[PDB]
Amino acid sequence: PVHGVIYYSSPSMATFLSPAQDNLVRTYFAQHLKKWVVQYKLYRNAVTPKTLEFLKQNINPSMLACVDEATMIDAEPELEDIIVRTKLWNFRQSFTIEGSIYEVGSFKVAIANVLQKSVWKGILFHVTYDGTESVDLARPIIQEFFLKCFLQNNKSVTPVYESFFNQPRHSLDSKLLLQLFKQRI
């Protein structure tokens, strides 16, 4: 249906995830589904051709992996091992996102920390709203709920994020997630 992706870089948002989940479950009766983790890796052969691969854990079976910025395919984890064995491609650079998906009344949200080697604690949210699929009506229902459910600090900070949209899958495209990492470096 219609889902929004929000993202925060403030340091307050840093400390925020665990108490955020806890309060979410306790106060709004959230139910905890699968933990979320995704892994981004970036390196490039001796002739300067960029290649990067990232791995949604939810649908790990298909690992999405693109050459330079331009060209991408879906492939298996063993492919990554292939590229390591060939040694022609250079050394990794790793981002990672770890959190857990909750289902709260009429929508499902993902609260995750983004970090590289446990560096920092910038938070990503992802709210799929079961319902109307009209972006213009979901955007303020989503926004309203998000405000309500995380309002303690909500006066204190503002995001940088990708706008919400409408997409049939219940999880956000892997290619889009790559684009988020690449705009994030």
Binding site: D22, V25, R26, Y28, F29, Q31
Partner: peptide
């Protein structure tokens, strides 16, 4: 089902 308020012997149920 409500979590975070009570421990093992009981399961707690509520309404918003």
């Amino acid at each position: 089902a409500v979590q975070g308020y009570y421990s093992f012997p009981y399961l707690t149920f509520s309404k918003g």
